[PDB]
């Protein structure tokens, strides 16, 4: 009879249609070839829609974050396999929304980055942690999508918005001080690149990978531009004085501190692209900029003794600070030696301009026994030393060893001439102010 079985099988199909039943209907259609189907398939696609939308919830900041139960995954896979862009359409619409909404729960890169630094730094670190978390949940999204399918296009379609947010925060970050956190961002983009390449796969997705790498390149290039900005900024610097003084300039401390921070990012900056060559070049050029500005603002003093004392202090501070770190780097030893020599030179020129006149006054060149002119020279000398001592007691060379060294220097160039001066005249009283030990006792007091 055959036909009765077929009609009864159609009846059973109708009895169920309200998976194998579809196959049965197909067999019946094939047998007859030798309306219920459409309904079953449409309700199947709407069933996939229903199941997908009923388990799409927002991941909460708190809790392998398990987005969907382990039970419904094979179900969704089966249903999807039964289907034939529509699946991608629904998945995109619902789940991408749910994903961006998921990122808005932790932070979200929701031109107007023009804010205060004090909150910008903390919000960038925030963005770092947000980057790590977001990638390490996008991993879960990817695993689920590639589990329910046996796919890249779907993942891409779902993630484009969220990753666009994340990446949108990073642009554009041009001014110094922002360089360190800029290279923090560089570090976090470098750290997760591999995981991004593993997660987003391709090829209909690669544009997110290259968007990420692209923003990384722009970030790094912007960092280099901040290098240029800082050296240029230290170069053309200005203002001002404080207690006048010949002591170390806060700018010098600021620059050596800046390079002291650039050396904390040595492993990162090595990835400059070479290696420590260019790092050394940047260090040497910001150093050169510092000293160039220093001599630029050293000619804004008087007497020249103060200028050379100041330059002595700052370049010595520079040399020492460099001798505390690297130094070992491609800055060299000839750099440290040359600059040490320059320091010694500033010291020498200070001693010359400061004490030449009083030293020639401490000699016999101008006499004429006499006693009268001898007394006149005694008074003259006393005035000279008093003025020099009261102008240079209020000065300050910070390095104790250096100041004691140069103290011993000026003492060693003054004491002999004065002692020889006393070993010829006198009492020839009390016109003989200061003895040897006395004159020595207020020499170890200047620069305090």
Swiss-Prot record:
Instruction: Quote the disruption phenotype from the UniProt entry.
Output: Dwarf and sterile plants with decreased apical dominance. Branched inflorescences due to ectopic initiation of lateral inflorescences instead of flowers. Altered polar growth of root hairs and stigmatic papillae. Reduced cell expansion and aberrant xylem development. Aberrant deposition of xylem secondary cell wall (SCW).
What keywords appear on the UniProt entry? Answer: Cell membrane, Cell wall, Cytoplasm, Cytoskeleton, Exocytosis, Membrane, Secreted, Transport
Q: Which Gene3D superfamilies does the protein's record reference?
A: Exocyst complex component Exo70 (1.20.1280.170)
Q: Which InterPro entries match?
A: Cullin_repeat-like_dom_sf, Exo70, Exo70_C
Give any Gene Ontology cellular component: cytosol
Task: Kindly indicate whether the keyword Cytoplasm belongs to this entry.
Answer: yes
GO MF annotations, alphabetized: phosphatidylinositol-4,5-bisphosphate binding
Where, subcellularly, is it found?
Cytoplasm, Cytosol; Cytoplasm, Cytoskeleton, Phragmoplast; Cell membrane; Secreted, Cell wall
According to the record, the segments passing through the membrane are none
- Does the keyword field hold Nuclease? no
- Which GO annotations describe the biological process of this protein? exocytosis; protoxylem development; regulation of exocyst localization; regulation of secondary cell wall biogenesis; xylem development; xylem vessel member cell differentiation
Q: Which Pfam families match?
A: Exo70_C, Exo70_N
Regarding protein family, the annotation reads:
Belongs to the EXO70 family.
State the oligomer form and interacting partners. The exocyst complex is composed of SEC3, SEC5, SEC6, SEC8, SEC10, EXO70A1 and EXO84B. Interacts with SEC3A and EXO84B. Co-localizes with FPP3/VETH1, FPP2/VETH2 and COG2 in vesicle-like small motile compartments. May interact with COG2.
Q: What is known about what this protein does?
A: Component of the exocyst complex involved in the docking of exocytic vesicles with fusion sites on the plasma membrane during regulated or polarized secretion. Involved in polarized cell growth and organ morphogenesis. Involved in polarized cell growth and organ morphogenesis. During cytokinesis, involved in cell plate initiation, cell plate maturation and formation of new primary cell wall. Participates in polarized pectin delivery required for the polarized development of the mucilage-producing volcano cells of the seed coat.
Q: Name it.
A: Exocyst complex component EXO70A1
Q: Which organism is it from?
A: Arabidopsis thaliana (Mouse-ear cress)
Q: What is the lineage of its organism?
A: Eukaryota, Viridiplantae, Streptophyta, Embryophyta, Tracheophyta
